[PDB]
Design a protein around this ligand. Sequence first.
Ligand SMILES: *[C@@H]1O[C@H](CO[C@@H]2O[C@@H](C)[C@@H](O)[C@@H](O)[C@@H]2O)[C@@H](O[C@@H]2O[C@H](CO)[C@@H](O)[C@H](O)[C@H]2NC(C)=O)[C@H](O)[C@H]1NC(C)=O
Ligand SMILES: *[C@@H]1O[C@H](CO[C@@H]2O[C@@H](C)[C@@H](O)[C@@H](O)[C@@H]2O)[C@@H](O[C@@H]2O[C@H](CO)[C@@H](O)[C@H](O)[C@H]2NC(C)=O)[C@H](O)[C@H]1NC(C)=O
Ligand SMILES: *[C@@H]1O[C@H](CO)[C@@H](O[C@@H]2O[C@H](CO)[C@@H](O)[C@H](O)[C@H]2NC(C)=O)[C@H](O)[C@H]1NC(C)=O
Ligand SMILES: *[C@@H]1O[C@H](CO)[C@@H](O[C@@H]2O[C@H](CO)[C@@H](O)[C@H](O)[C@H]2NC(C)=O)[C@H](O)[C@H]1NC(C)=O
Ligand code: NAG
Ligand code: NAG
Ligand code: K
Ligand code: K
Ligand code: K
Ligand code: K
Ligand code: K
Ligand code: K
Ligand code: K
Ligand code: K
Ligand code: K
Ligand code: K
Ligand code: K
Ligand code: K
Ligand code: K
Ligand code: K
Ligand code: K
Ligand code: K
Ligand code: K
Ligand code: K
Ligand code: K
Ligand code: K
Ligand code: K
Ligand code: K
Lengths: 316, 316
Amino acid sequence: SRSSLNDDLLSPYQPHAKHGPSHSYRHVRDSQPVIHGNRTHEEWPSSNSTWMPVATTRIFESKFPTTSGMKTAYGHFTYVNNPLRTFSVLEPGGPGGCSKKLTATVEETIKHGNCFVAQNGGYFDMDTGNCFGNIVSDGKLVQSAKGIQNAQFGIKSDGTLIFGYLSEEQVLEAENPFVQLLSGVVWLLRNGEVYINQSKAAESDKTQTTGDFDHFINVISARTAIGHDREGRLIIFHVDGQTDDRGLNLWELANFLKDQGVINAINLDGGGSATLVINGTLANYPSDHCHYNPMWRCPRSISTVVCVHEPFCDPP
Amino acid sequence: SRSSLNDDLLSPYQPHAKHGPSHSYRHVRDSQPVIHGNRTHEEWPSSNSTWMPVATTRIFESKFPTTSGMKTAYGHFTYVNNPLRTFSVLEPGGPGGCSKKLTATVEETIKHGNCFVAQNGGYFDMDTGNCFGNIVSDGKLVQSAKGIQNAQFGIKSDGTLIFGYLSEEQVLEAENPFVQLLSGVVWLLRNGEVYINQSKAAESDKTQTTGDFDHFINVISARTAIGHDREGRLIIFHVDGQTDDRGLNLWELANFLKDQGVINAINLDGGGSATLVINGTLANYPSDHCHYNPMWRCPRSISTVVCVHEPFCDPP
Ligand SMILES: *[C@@H]1O[C@H](CO[C@@H]2O[C@@H](C)[C@@H](O)[C@@H](O)[C@@H]2O)[C@@H](O[C@@H]2O[C@H](CO)[C@@H](O)[C@H](O)[C@H]2NC(C)=O)[C@H](O)[C@H]1NC(C)=O
Ligand SMILES: *[C@@H]1O[C@H](CO[C@@H]2O[C@@H](C)[C@@H](O)[C@@H](O)[C@@H]2O)[C@@H](O[C@@H]2O[C@H](CO)[C@@H](O)[C@H](O)[C@H]2NC(C)=O)[C@H](O)[C@H]1NC(C)=O
Ligand SMILES: *[C@@H]1O[C@H](CO)[C@@H](O[C@@H]2O[C@H](CO)[C@@H](O)[C@H](O)[C@H]2NC(C)=O)[C@H](O)[C@H]1NC(C)=O
Ligand SMILES: *[C@@H]1O[C@H](CO)[C@@H](O[C@@H]2O[C@H](CO)[C@@H](O)[C@H](O)[C@H]2NC(C)=O)[C@H](O)[C@H]1NC(C)=O
Ligand SMILES: *[C@@H]1O[C@H](CO)[C@@H](O)[C@H](O)[C@H]1NC(C)=O
Ligand SMILES: *[C@@H]1O[C@H](CO)[C@@H](O)[C@H](O)[C@H]1NC(C)=O
Ligand SMILES: [K+]
Ligand SMILES: [K+]
Ligand SMILES: [K+]
Ligand SMILES: [K+]
Ligand SMILES: [K+]
Ligand SMILES: [K+]
Ligand SMILES: [K+]
Ligand SMILES: [K+]
Ligand SMILES: [K+]
Ligand SMILES: [K+]
Ligand SMILES: [K+]
Ligand SMILES: [K+]
Ligand SMILES: [K+]
Ligand SMILES: [K+]
Ligand SMILES: [K+]
Ligand SMILES: [K+]
Ligand SMILES: [K+]
Ligand SMILES: [K+]
Ligand SMILES: [K+]
Ligand SMILES: [K+]
Ligand SMILES: [K+]
Ligand SMILES: [K+]
């Protein structure tokens, strides 16, 4: 059930199946900056504010300097209050989706879920539909990365925001467990600092050529990100573009989020996967072309989804 | 109740109050190309197809040639079937709005109207909120231009699409009367041909300097347009931008619609007024900045609205 032609492909690794670095979690800890010691992640309390509304979306059309003048980037910031109760990680098509290797547009996945805001989530194998990385959907472990080291984001049972690199046992921890968790590629910001260089060492093997991953970081394209600010509010970011023509690169994206006050953030699936569905209707410009017409752009059939909804078992 | 700062102002005439040319309808007929004789308008039957859905929206991110390389324009085409029964022209805030000189975002105006698709409509005085040009809202004459000559679009009682320059009596005709009618500025396409040069002669006085109006045509900015194709389907177009930075000019916009098969079309309010609300949620990038923050973009409080809705007194 392809909806788009998947022609704006921004792939970090080649081939698509060999996703993530093969080196050990030990090596991530060993090769990260000494200032961090043996902490491969960062924690922050999620906001408990019950103010209305849950999510506030803000539009931007901002200029960025290039060697050939300036460039404009269209996108949105979404600020989420009470992410413990309002933020969820959904499988494609509904519960049990990743095990069937389903791909579905964000519109299709949240069909009945009543998601105020929703964007595409983590990475996936384009040919097979296989989900990539750790996935915890509303308290239930969907799958595990078996120790593969990419940037992670999750919410704990007590409402603690987790960003960074997690070992397998940290993911499968039974005490204060993850209630929401997904995996991206590249740790954008760590404790208010740009963390691109450090992500190269952590999420790409030294045996391989520093070519395919560097292109993933330096090329401009559509991007999505998820982070947080001082107030414990979730940041669900997306910037429209077209790989090697429009958008931002992870260096620009990192500084953009940092300038706006994001402490920690990770890069989620970008390119033609970038999708923003506000209150049921698509609200951004996807970069894939439609299955049916060669000049009309369509959203992509993606994997997991990040959804913001009403609190659960609380106001009513 | 300003929602935006009205800082992306694309004004055709100066001052805003002296809207439209002062010359006579006689002069429009006299100074138009002889090939058209004494016909100052064009007619086309509206489609009677009851196929589902009523409106189909299509995204584009298209390149346009500039002297300094290429430029990209984000926007939407909306194709409307059965416009006689599904297309309406709404006053700001609801019936009786233009007489009170109300301005309201498209979201606010269609609050309960259940409009599948909706865009900003005609022009208005920014300082006073006064509506400009002829306005017929669901069969009821709201106001008249008193013979002021700008590009017009309307639907007749029998379903005939009217595009072009109308004299006052043509507007107030009691036999086969207008059921929907609004006024823009600049006739983009006339019978499948670019009609910009001809609009200069018709919609700007020769006494005035050819400076303020030429800038309105040659500057690039956000634009909205309404036209039709061979099949009698309505075209509701919009292209995001920022005056003198992003978007298209009426020359580019005319050829863009012509290349896509639009026979007749007129230019409606552009700049920061450009707004597209799909199924209740804003689906484009407005160019005005928000009243509350200096870097977030907000939609504008505009005047009339073009709404696409379900057929009236027909399926149920
Ligand atoms: C992670 O490291 C901390 C800090 O200790 C580091 O290691 C030392 C060699 C020294 O160089 C410090 O400056 C480093 O920052 C460990 O903290 C402790 O480990 C020792 C174990 O003998 C214990 O005496 C302390 O109480 C520990 N403190 C805490 C808070 O745990 C920590 O054990 C290391 N964690 C893991 C999982 O290895
Ligand atoms: C609008 O013009 C048409 C066409 O006539 C034009 O005028 C002539 C002088 C000649 O140069 C034609 O080639 C032009 O195109 C008018 O058509 C007619 O008018 C005369 C009136 O004496 C009549 O004999 C014809 O039957 C008319 N035909 C039609 C279809 O009306 C027409 O009257 C003009 N309309 C208006 C409102 O002035
Ligand atoms: C999605 O639609 C809902 C409508 O149910 C919006 O809800 C409200 O927003 C207004 C103003 O923004 C508030 O006054 C209400 O209190 C909100 N209601 C609820 C239940 O939250 C909601 O804002 C929309 N979401 C987005 C992102 O636009
Ligand atoms: C606005 O939302 C409505 C939901 O009620 C959409 O309705 C349908 O679209 C699907 C597929 O596009 C069709 O299978 C249905 O028959 C449509 N239903 C109706 C009542 O028209 C509608 O398409 C949406 N409009 C836009 C512009 O996105
Ligand atoms: C950091 O990244 C820059 C890219 O601008 C590179 O030139 C530099 O060598 C990197 N430094 C380290 C220590 O990785
Ligand atoms: C038509 O418009 C062009 C603008 O490119 C102008 O140069 C030309 O003089 C115009 N011709 C007429 C007859 O108005
Ligand atoms: K599928
Ligand atoms: K593309
Ligand atoms: K270290
Ligand atoms: K560091
Ligand atoms: K909101
Ligand atoms: K906003
Ligand atoms: K991908
Ligand atoms: K491993
Ligand atoms: K390589
Ligand atoms: K930097
Ligand atoms: K802040
Ligand atoms: K107002
Ligand atoms: K502006
Ligand atoms: K003539
Ligand atoms: K002509
Ligand atoms: K549709
Ligand atoms: K589409
Ligand atoms: K205006
Ligand atoms: K007059
Ligand atoms: K002038
Ligand atoms: K031309
Ligand atoms: K056609």
